[PDB]
Design a protein around this ligand. Structure first.
Ligand code: GW7
Length: 292
């Protein structure tokens, strides 16, 4: 027979995913490595073409779920989220994305500390929130939002990366086993420490921690405090301190991201809009000396 027609006005997903030959890629050096896998700086020469496209290649240490997640990653079309360019299937599956020349935001803030102003910092808060807004719109939880997973295309333009990988490697099992989670506890929403209760509102918590990293120019959350003690401290009401440059206006935005009640936290829509209006008058909201 012929299948009963039932249209839904959802637009076709015409995203392209390129399956790349092993030999189209060369690795220059290592950029980073961790629970997620190793990220290499590299060169992609497409099949038949000449141009040597600067790329990052990620190798991970089920494949139906991977090819499903790869579809999501390639479908992302937003200025402040990365897009997967290609997948290489051999010898093991490699992820290929455009290299960001100014690197990771966490490294960028610490290195350019003495020359980052209030306008720049407040604009990054908007761009991050916007990209997350776009993820949420698609019902996609990042699970591992952190300054370390925000890359700098140019000083005035950041992109979020590494969305999807956490769920792909961990799964959705409510109970943690003895191995625990792969994401760092100190960026994690309280409810996700105890069980896997990952939602857009848990990402919001992580957003709060991410923007604190920026306002402290690469500060380390709960610095020195061992990760075993965190779940107890958070439940006793402990939160990150007010960064020196932060007005109470900015700090309260942060604090609201760390409410016990996940529903009480700001939505990404509210976060982008508030930092937007702050970015219209950035010296009323962040107090950095020399920032005239
Ligand atoms: C610190 C200096 C850096 C510059 C830079 N430029 C581009 N990509 C980088 N890292 C990177 C992170 C994740 C990667 O694959 C995972 C992934 C997740 C979601 C969408 C993607 F396109 C991909 C991939 Cl393939 C790469 C990095 S890291």
């Amino acid at each position: 027979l012929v299948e009963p027609l039932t249209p839904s006005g959802t637009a076709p997903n015409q995203a392209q995913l390129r399956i790349l030959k092993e030999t189209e890629l060369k690795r220059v050096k290592v950029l980073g490595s961790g629970a997620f896998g190793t990220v290499y700086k590299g060169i992609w020469v497409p099949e038949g073409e000449t141009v040597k496209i600067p790329v990052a290649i990620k190798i991970l240490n089920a494949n139906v779920e991977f090819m499903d997640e790869a579809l999501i990653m390639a479908s992302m079309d937003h200025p402040h989220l990365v897009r997967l360019l290609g997948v290489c299937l051999s010898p093991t599956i490699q992820l290929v994305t455009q290299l960001m020349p100014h690197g990771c935001l966490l490294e960028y803030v610490h290195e350019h500390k003495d020359n980052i102003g209030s306008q720049l910092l407040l604009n990054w808060c908007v761009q991050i929130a916007k990209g997350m807004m776009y993820l949420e719109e698609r019902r996609l939880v990042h699970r591992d939002l952190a300054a370390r997973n925000v890359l700098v295309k140019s000083p005035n333009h950041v992109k979020i990366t590494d969305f999807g990988l956490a769920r792909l490697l961990e799964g959705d099992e409510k109970e943690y086993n003895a191995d625990g989670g792969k994401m760092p506890i100190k960026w994690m929403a309280l409810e996700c420490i105890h069980y896997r209760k990952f939602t857009h509102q848990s990402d919001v918590w992580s957003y709060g921690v991410t923007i604190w990293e920026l306002m402290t120019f690469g500060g380390k959350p709960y610095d020195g405090i061992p990760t075993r003690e965190i779940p107890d401290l958070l439940e006793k009401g402990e939160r990150l301190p007010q960064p020196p440059i932060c007005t109470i206006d900015v700090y309260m935005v942060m604090v609201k991201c760390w409410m016990i009640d996940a529903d009480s936290r700001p939505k990404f829509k509210e976060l982008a809009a508030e930092f937007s209006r702050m970015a219209r008058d950035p010296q009323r909201y962040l107090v950095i000396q020399g920032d005239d």
